[PDB]
Amino acid sequence: RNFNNLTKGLCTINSWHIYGKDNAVRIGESSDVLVTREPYVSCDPDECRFYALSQGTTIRGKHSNGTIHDRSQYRALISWPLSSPPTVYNSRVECIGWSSTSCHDGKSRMSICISGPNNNASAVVWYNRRPVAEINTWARNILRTQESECVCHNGVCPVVFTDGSATGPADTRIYYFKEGKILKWESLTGTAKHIEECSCYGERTGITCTCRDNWQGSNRPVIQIDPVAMTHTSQYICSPVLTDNPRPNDPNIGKCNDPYPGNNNNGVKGFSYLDGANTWLGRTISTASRSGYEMLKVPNALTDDRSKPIQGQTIVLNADWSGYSGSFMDYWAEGDCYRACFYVELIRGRPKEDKVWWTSNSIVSMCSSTEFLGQWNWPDGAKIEYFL
Amino acid sequence: RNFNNLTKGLCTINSWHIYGKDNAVRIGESSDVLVTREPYVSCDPDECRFYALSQGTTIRGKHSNGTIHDRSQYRALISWPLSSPPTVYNSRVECIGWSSTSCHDGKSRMSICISGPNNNASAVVWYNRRPVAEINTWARNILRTQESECVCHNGVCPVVFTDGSATGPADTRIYYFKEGKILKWESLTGTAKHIEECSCYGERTGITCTCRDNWQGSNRPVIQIDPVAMTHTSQYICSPVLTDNPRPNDPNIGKCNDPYPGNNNNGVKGFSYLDGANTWLGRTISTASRSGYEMLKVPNALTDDRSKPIQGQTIVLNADWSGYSGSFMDYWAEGDCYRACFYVELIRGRPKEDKVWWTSNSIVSMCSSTEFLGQWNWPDGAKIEYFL
Amino acid sequence: RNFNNLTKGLCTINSWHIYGKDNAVRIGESSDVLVTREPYVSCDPDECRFYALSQGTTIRGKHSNGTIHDRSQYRALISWPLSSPPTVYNSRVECIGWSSTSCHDGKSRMSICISGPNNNASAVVWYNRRPVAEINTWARNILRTQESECVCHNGVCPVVFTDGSATGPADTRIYYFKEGKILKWESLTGTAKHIEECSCYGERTGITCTCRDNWQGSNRPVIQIDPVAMTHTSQYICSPVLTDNPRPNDPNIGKCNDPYPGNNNNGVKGFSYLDGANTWLGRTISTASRSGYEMLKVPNALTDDRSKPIQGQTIVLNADWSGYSGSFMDYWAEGDCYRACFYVELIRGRPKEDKVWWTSNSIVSMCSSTEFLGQWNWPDGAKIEYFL
Amino acid sequence: RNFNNLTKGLCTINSWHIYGKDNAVRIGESSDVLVTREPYVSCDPDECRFYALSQGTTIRGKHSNGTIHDRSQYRALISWPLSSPPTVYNSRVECIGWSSTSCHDGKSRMSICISGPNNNASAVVWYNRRPVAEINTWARNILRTQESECVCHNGVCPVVFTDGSATGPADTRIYYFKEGKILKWESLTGTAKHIEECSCYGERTGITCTCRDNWQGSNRPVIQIDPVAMTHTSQYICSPVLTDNPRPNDPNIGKCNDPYPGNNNNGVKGFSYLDGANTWLGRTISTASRSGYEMLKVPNALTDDRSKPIQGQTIVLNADWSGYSGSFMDYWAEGDCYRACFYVELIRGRPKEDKVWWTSNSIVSMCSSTEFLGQWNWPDGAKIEYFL
Numbered sequence A, B, C, D: 001r002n003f004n005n006l007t008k009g010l011c012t013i014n015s016w017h018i019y020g021k022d023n024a025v026r027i028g029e030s031s032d033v034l035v036t037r038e039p040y041v042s043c044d045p046d047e048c049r050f051y052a053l054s055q056g057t058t059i060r061g062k063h064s065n066g067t068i069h070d071r072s073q074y075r076a077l078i079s080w081p082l083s084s085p086p087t088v089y090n091s092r093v094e095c096i097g098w099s100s101t102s103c104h105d106g107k108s109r110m111s112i113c114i115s116g117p118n119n120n121a122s123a124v125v126w127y128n129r130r131p132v133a134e135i136n137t138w139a140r141n142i143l144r145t146q147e148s149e150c151v152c153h154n155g156v157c158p159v160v161f162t163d164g165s166a167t168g169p170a171d172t173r174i175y176y177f178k179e180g181k182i183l184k185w186e187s188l189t190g191t192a193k194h195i196e197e198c199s200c201y202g203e204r205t206g207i208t209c210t211c212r213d214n215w216q217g218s219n220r221p222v223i224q225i226d227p228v229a230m231t232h233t234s235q236y237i238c239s240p241v242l243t244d245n246p247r248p249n250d251p252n253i254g255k256c257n258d259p260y261p262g263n264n265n266n267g268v269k270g271f272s273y274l275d276g277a278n279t280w281l282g283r284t285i286s287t288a289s290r291s292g293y294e295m296l297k298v299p300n301a302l303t304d305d306r307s308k309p310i311q312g313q314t315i316v317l318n319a320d321w322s323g324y325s326g327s328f329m330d331y332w333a334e335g336d337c338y339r340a341c342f343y344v345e346l347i348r349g350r351p352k353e354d355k356v357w358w359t360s361n362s363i364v365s366m367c368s369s370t371e372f373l374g375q376w377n378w379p380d381g382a383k384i385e386y387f388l
């Protein structure tokens, strides 16, 4: 087997087709389905799987009580077959912790999980299902990482980490791993002022990450990584089509090098594909809460501070709960281009649905089509009253 | 591995032997068994599996309430090991949607699922577990396909699709795929006046599909496909042994080129093996409802409008519920001939059993024997009262 | 891969060690464990598995009600990993039916299941997980077979079948299969007067089967099969140590060529290893019912009508329920000899425990040791009151 | 494949990172999780798995009542995927019995299970999933072994056994196996006065086992084994940092060649890594009961009767229940050194929590880091009240 190289461009995105959906909460009403949050999708050369942070209990289990909590000793990164739900009997534990990323380099998979108390957290880097390297907290304030897949080129897999305040200046680092070993790390440079939960994808130009400014900005920070030189730059998406949540209404001029103001100390993990005229942005439909999800085609969104949508597709209706979203691609698929994909976390339970005492989610995922396909909407589909 | 070629004739059919049965509803009374409908069977070169459309809930789950509904966002084509039931923990999702077909070409499996609202549905074609091609609705009225396996020759896999009215003239197309890519499609030609849910099988002469005229006819439409030239013809089974349900009583003269009248705007998916003197037809025993199932040997049924049975075999008693039926064969079996097989969907719950709020099914399947074997009958076997 | 040849003798049997035990009824009190009966054990070249006839329901399921019944459309031969219980999610269906045998020939596994009504039953012979040959009833009275593994030599696998009365003269046949095809069959010859449920094992001398005379005899019939010439002989175990159940007390002179009288129209499946001075017989401890199990070393039991035990080992206490027993060996194990093994079916529920409405079992199995090992006893271990 | 050779030293231990945790009791509150005790961890060349002694029932099952009991016919050594819980559907039975060890030699795995009544117990040695050799009790008083993994060098796998009194002089033997065959055994020599439940690890110097003196000593006995010459020596850990439980308070002078007095007729399975200045000892935090767990760096603990800690790490808070602990390493990992690992059994239920009628456990495991990582604490995490 050989290391995968990023040698293709993105396929032209004219619409999005359904890729996967696990209906986990519906099924977990009467099955041994693990409580999760922070899901994602990641491909091996022979298989694509769903990933998430388990809470170490099933939904019907009494220990689901209190699972709105983020960081406990009972969490772990699990993976399971595409569009199956995460069950006790089919979920594979990748590592123990409450913040994670994972990616295949063409030869083997690297998985990273962070665990610990707020002031003493540490990352363990697994490669080919064995622990290889460990990284101690550098700011002693919740060391944390992407919550979606990383991307590799010629064996080098960059990962974005943050340690420090979630509502002020923090210490973000980009690490470059190979076979789980640390080749290099560097402090964040560029004009992004705060970085959380980067969603990344790779193509021939390099690796692109769209992140979450949890401090002052409702536009999204972008980090662009050269995996060969192992260097990066950062800025914001220039477009006035703002894609964080909550957020102000869309103005007519965006901000390329500073946070767009109006909403502070909150946000949601999200993603974009930035590819000139082939640029598509994801966002919640609501500006106030994690409900709805849409994709909008916004030409040159990265660089054009006047850019507006010329096409779009509704993924989840505003009436339905959404949540985290992130990017992934099947780098091992046949063809001359990489087909853009994404997932949306469909959060059920607390805080928005507090008649139950748990918080969990299901997953919906889509990939791009060169056809102009009809659109549906894709809700979680569970009836909360059934759990009372 | 090589593409499979259709190089054999059908084995002589002198009776039918039990092949598989999953007892899904019996088991699902007290196990995590997925609610399904529209099942079928399809073989890989190394394994044969059951397939069906899950409803994204177990039978005992509260979300089974309302599963008489056909098209929701919570459906998916799943597959699972022969004669096991479709459980949450053993079912593999092939793709997301509410109408499907699937077949192995000798090298890899193609699966097609259609999803969307009635006026904006789209098919995604998967090959070797990856999405490859997409087809948007052409008539904007429930794009839909076979609900049983397709058949391949030298890598070419024809599939029958319909889009448009289910009770009037519609737009039927035959698509020819190879490795999931569209080689060609063509509009339906011939004398069949309406096409739904084709059940197909292949042999050296070509591919034969027996379908459902949901409009005016109670005889079944037949499409005969040449997978090399990628062309087809269509007509009806000429025999006065009528095999749709509901249906008029058997007359003494059938219709080769037009619907046999008496019952409109309904029908059921079914199948036949049309092979001269080796011809066998399947049908429900009842002329009014989906109950019972029998196989009847009717020589030259395809071409002889006077043909009557000379032999038969009861599969399911008239006292027991049946449902959809379709054809499949193990093209990779040893020997000088292809052994004809079929499945019968045994529907339980609504609309016929409305004391429960769900609709599901189990599966029974048979293959042909050159012996004259004794016959049994094969009911679903669940006691509905247990679910109250 | 090559066909296995029977080239070794039996290992010297000085005691028996625990081999496997699934505790199925204990576990099935609170797990999705299938109701079964008629279990056995059979080895592949790379794995050994438990086998049994499922009743198509779990024990806690309401459909377990009435499972004392022998022959329904909901039964199937299943196999599952050694010492695991037969669960809905781990059991592999081998074929559909209510009487079975199975064995590996070194290259692939043959499995045979019989299904049908009493007067029209038929066997389907599966080889390498595909149906290959079918055999219709010849006496129209419950065609039936071994209920434990068959044995193969150089690809030839003999199987004993009976069709006809269970309480009078019947039509027993020995079939010789290769790759699932019928090479030959022959009517029973020799002095055995009635044959049921043969337990067989192979070694360099040939294949030895110990069966159940359900008509007049409480000594066990023996069939000795030459798998090369494809011929056989039959007689009874000469020893006055009688091993059927129920049975008279042990006399001082046995019967080699006729049934030992006293008990009619009943019996139980059992086994023996007949190997000169290395001869061991299994039997229930009770002479009246299926309770207890012991192994007794009885030199030349096959040929010596005065032979008595010189050593023994208790397997299950008389206070605990037993049931069917049969032989198997791991023909693919390392060494210069074949290690004798057996299983005992531990029946729980009806008819003996009628406070529950079901009948099921667990399995215990042992293999021989050349050491003189201490003995334990091995009960099913479930508390029936827990199921009320 | 080749036999593994112990050719490396231990990696430098500067802290411990989380390796695995199954949260079994939390999950088993509402899932089919087997009741267990005496767990451990052991690696194959391609996978690492959790191991334990099942009680042949799930926790929610009524048969969990009375599982404080040590030795029944319903126990078996099971293994299951790393950090998954031991479920009915994912647990693989290695052998039947109530005391065990297991290890991979580089080619195949050897597993040993002991079963029987107190006065007639016997060990069966499995190699490559087949029984190979058997060992009868020599002292007729609960033949018993390590309860954690053994270690192999060039195919030779030493195992420590004890037979006889648990509260007085007993007959301890060291057996040397290869491919499951007994190469040699020898009676215990050296100054250790009583040996139970040895935890072992291997490196280039040889095999080191830290055991439990259940008779008079609260310091731990050590057996050092040369797997090439197949000889051993024994003594105690000289350090006054006492590591058995219960135990006296730490004095300032330890005992190298006799039990340190104060606590009699009790103890707990534990472990240490004895490696000069790289020496780390594990122990419960409490001196009275199995609660808490800590690792302490104690230079030359084996040989220095004045040695005290210079570094440490809390694993489980004193407020939380612990239990057995033992050593294992991934001998097949990449690198120039063996990374020390261990597990801690987290016992829940009886005797300490008697509002429930069962006794079970979950597992936490750690490996060493050359970094100085922040520490967390790792409780079982189940709420006992949920089970009432």
Ligand SMILES: *[C@@H]1O[C@H](CO)[C@@H](O[C@@H]2O[C@H](CO)[C@@H](O[C@@H]3O[C@H](CO[C@H]4O[C@H](CO[C@H]5O[C@H](CO)[C@@H](O)[C@H](O)[C@@H]5O)[C@@H](O)[C@H](O[C@H]5O[C@H](CO)[C@@H](O)[C@H](O)[C@@H]5O)[C@@H]4O)[C@@H](O)[C@H](O[C@H]4O[C@H](CO)[C@@H](O)[C@H](O)[C@@H]4O[C@H]4O[C@H](CO)[C@@H](O)[C@H](O)[C@@H]4O[C@H]4O[C@H](CO)[C@@H](O)[C@H](O)[C@@H]4O)[C@@H]3O)[C@H](O)[C@H]2NC(C)=O)[C@H](O)[C@H]1NC(C)=O
Binding pocket: A240, A241, A248, A249, A250, A284, A285, A286, A287, A294, A295, A296, A308, A309, A310, A311, A312, A313, A372, A373, A374, A375, B119, B120
């Ligand atoms: C079957 O399926 C198919 C396939 O899905 C369905 O077809 C799809 O239909 C949907 C729904 O209509 C479309 O999505 C919308 O797309 C438009 C963009 O396309 C329009 O505008 C284009 C650009 O026009 C501008 O430039 C051109 C020059 O290039 C110039 O000529 C023009 O005058 C103008 O200057 C047009 O090019 C385009 O026309 C083309 O396409 C037409 C079909 O759509 C076709 O008919 C034409 O002939 C031509 O070919 C078209 O006019 C998006 O603008 C829109 O997204 C906005 O609206 C939705 C609500 O619906 C909202 O959620 C979005 O967030 C967004 O609106 C917010 O953001 C804006 C930007 O900041 C802002 O300006 C808005 O005020 C609004 O802001 C508010 O809400 C947000 C979100 O909550 C909040 O954050 C803000 O603060 C604020 O509160 C949709 O994405 C698909 O594109 C279309 N697909 C295809 C292939 O056709 C079909 O309908 C289905 N059939 C059936 C029967 O159902």
Ligand SMILES: *[C@@H]1O[C@H](CO)[C@@H](O[C@@H]2O[C@H](CO)[C@@H](O[C@@H]3O[C@H](CO[C@H]4O[C@H](CO[C@H]5O[C@H](CO)[C@@H](O)[C@H](O)[C@@H]5O)[C@@H](O)[C@H](O[C@H]5O[C@H](CO)[C@@H](O)[C@H](O)[C@@H]5O)[C@@H]4O)[C@@H](O)[C@H](O[C@H]4O[C@H](CO)[C@@H](O)[C@H](O)[C@@H]4O[C@H]4O[C@H](CO)[C@@H](O)[C@H](O)[C@@H]4O[C@H]4O[C@H](CO)[C@@H](O)[C@H](O)[C@@H]4O)[C@@H]3O)[C@H](O)[C@H]2NC(C)=O)[C@H](O)[C@H]1NC(C)=O
Binding pocket: B240, B241, B248, B249, B250, B284, B285, B286, B287, B294, B295, B296, B308, B309, B310, B311, B312, B313, B372, B373, B374, B375, C119, C120
């Ligand atoms: C153990 O197992 C074995 C193996 O399964 C069992 O043996 C089987 O038994 C079953 C049940 O009897 C048989 O199925 C029936 O087969 C007959 C056809 O065979 C008969 O007719 C043949 C043709 O005769 C015609 O042509 C010949 C010239 O070739 C001429 O000589 C003759 O006079 C006539 O002109 C005969 O050749 C054949 O004889 C042969 O076989 C005999 C054994 O069967 C043997 O004894 C003979 O010696 C000779 O070898 C035999 O006479 C089918 O006609 C029949 O199917 C009809 O009836 C069932 C109800 O039972 C119904 O459900 C079917 O739909 C069908 O009847 C409907 O359709 C007809 C056609 O339109 C119509 O005319 C009817 O009025 C009826 O229509 C009504 O109902 C339908 C359905 O609801 C509705 O849609 C309509 O609108 C309307 O309301 C059976 O399939 C097996 O063939 C047989 N198998 C074997 C190998 O023998 C055995 O019984 C078991 N043993 C025990 C102890 O149980």
Ligand SMILES: *[C@@H]1O[C@H](CO)[C@@H](O[C@@H]2O[C@H](CO)[C@@H](O[C@@H]3O[C@H](CO[C@H]4O[C@H](CO[C@H]5O[C@H](CO)[C@@H](O)[C@H](O)[C@@H]5O)[C@@H](O)[C@H](O[C@H]5O[C@H](CO)[C@@H](O)[C@H](O)[C@@H]5O)[C@@H]4O)[C@@H](O)[C@H](O[C@H]4O[C@H](CO)[C@@H](O)[C@H](O)[C@@H]4O[C@H]4O[C@H](CO)[C@@H](O)[C@H](O)[C@@H]4O[C@H]4O[C@H](CO)[C@@H](O)[C@H](O)[C@@H]4O)[C@@H]3O)[C@H](O)[C@H]2NC(C)=O)[C@H](O)[C@H]1NC(C)=O
Binding pocket: C240, C241, C248, C249, C250, C284, C285, C286, C287, C294, C295, C296, C308, C309, C310, C311, C312, C313, C372, C373, C374, C375, D119, D120
């Ligand atoms: C730790 O574990 C070890 C290993 O398991 C335990 O040791 C085992 O202990 C058990 C239980 O005692 C033994 O099983 C019994 O074996 C005897 C046979 O061995 C005895 O007899 C031998 C033959 O003697 C005859 O020939 C010799 C010449 O060769 C001659 O010298 C002699 O006088 C006589 O003529 C002796 O050779 C043998 O001695 C040897 O072994 C001794 C140890 O056992 C040793 O001490 C000696 O020094 C010497 O080495 C020994 O005396 C079986 O006969 C017996 O089976 C019968 O009894 C049980 C009930 O216990 C019953 O269930 C059986 O069915 C059977 O009895 C029925 O059938 C008989 C035959 O028809 C009939 O005659 C009986 O009347 C009876 O029939 C009634 O019941 C049946 C069944 O319900 C019914 O069908 C009938 O109709 C009727 O109602 C046991 O199998 C093991 O052999 C022994 N193993 C070893 C390796 O030692 C040890 O105990 C454990 N330790 C502890 C502390 O627990």
Ligand SMILES: *[C@@H]1O[C@H](CO)[C@@H](O[C@@H]2O[C@H](CO)[C@@H](O[C@@H]3O[C@H](CO[C@H]4O[C@H](CO[C@H]5O[C@H](CO)[C@@H](O)[C@H](O)[C@@H]5O)[C@@H](O)[C@H](O[C@H]5O[C@H](CO)[C@@H](O)[C@H](O)[C@@H]5O)[C@@H]4O)[C@@H](O)[C@H](O[C@H]4O[C@H](CO)[C@@H](O)[C@H](O)[C@@H]4O[C@H]4O[C@H](CO)[C@@H](O)[C@H](O)[C@@H]4O[C@H]4O[C@H](CO)[C@@H](O)[C@H](O)[C@@H]4O)[C@@H]3O)[C@H](O)[C@H]2NC(C)=O)[C@H](O)[C@H]1NC(C)=O
Binding pocket: A119, A120, D240, D241, D248, D249, D250, D284, D285, D286, D287, D294, D295, D296, D308, D309, D310, D311, D312, D313, D372, D373, D374, D375
């Ligand atoms: C983020 O995470 C990091 C990483 O985990 C955290 O840092 C860790 O913090 C923990 C907790 O403090 C430390 O564990 C303790 O380690 C000490 C040993 O280190 C101390 O002592 C060393 C030796 O000093 C001696 O020799 C030197 C010469 O070499 C001489 O100079 C000195 O004067 C003295 O003679 C020092 O070298 C060492 O200093 C170094 O490290 C310091 C950081 O720790 C640093 O600040 C210094 O600059 C320098 O670099 C340090 O002083 C252990 O002694 C201790 O274990 C004892 O105490 C715990 C309770 O806390 C107890 O459970 C243990 O069992 C043990 O105490 C029992 O046993 C003793 C031995 O018999 C006995 O003497 C005690 O009385 C006691 O006995 C009683 O209890 C037991 C158990 O119940 C019972 O059996 C008895 O009968 C009796 O009842 C801890 O293990 C880590 O080492 C440290 N790790 C690192 C890398 O720094 C950090 O805190 C986290 N951050 C935050 C914000 O939370």
Ligand SMILES: CCC(CC)O[C@@H]1C=C(C(=O)O)C[C@H](N)[C@H]1NC(C)=O
Binding pocket: A038, A070, A071, A098, A099, A142, A144, A166, A196, A214, A267, A268
């Ligand atoms: C601690 C900062 C971080 C980013 C803003 O908070 C998160 C936001 C959450 C959210 O906004 O839904 C859920 C996360 N699991 C969480 N990460 C951790 C490690 O707890």
Ligand SMILES: CCC(CC)O[C@@H]1C=C(C(=O)O)C[C@H](N)[C@H]1NC(C)=O
Binding pocket: B038, B070, B071, B098, B099, B142, B144, B166, B196, B214, B267, B268
């Ligand atoms: C929409 C037309 C179509 C064919 C008549 O209806 C079907 C008949 C059904 C039936 O007659 O049982 C069930 C089907 N799942 C269905 N197909 C879809 C896509 O909903």
Ligand SMILES: CCC(CC)O[C@@H]1C=C(C(=O)O)C[C@H](N)[C@H]1NC(C)=O
Binding pocket: C038, C070, C071, C098, C099, C142, C144, C166, C196, C214, C267, C268
């Ligand atoms: C029909 C005769 C046969 C042998 C005596 O009866 C059996 C005895 C039984 C028994 O004695 O327990 C159970 C069997 N499952 C059964 N076989 C069939 C095919 O029903």
Ligand SMILES: [Ca+2]
Binding pocket: A212, A213, A214, A215, A216, A217, A218, A244, A245, A263, A264, A265, A266, A267, A268
């Ligand atoms: Ca923000």
Ligand SMILES: [Ca+2]
Binding pocket: B212, B213, B214, B215, B216, B217, B218, B244, B245, B263, B264, B265, B266, B267, B268
């Ligand atoms: Ca019709």
Ligand SMILES: [Ca+2]
Binding pocket: C212, C213, C214, C215, C216, C217, C218, C244, C245, C263, C264, C265, C266, C267, C268
């Ligand atoms: Ca009898």
Ligand SMILES: [Ca+2]
Binding pocket: D212, D213, D214, D215, D216, D217, D218, D244, D245, D263, D264, D265, D266, D267, D268
């Ligand atoms: Ca002690």
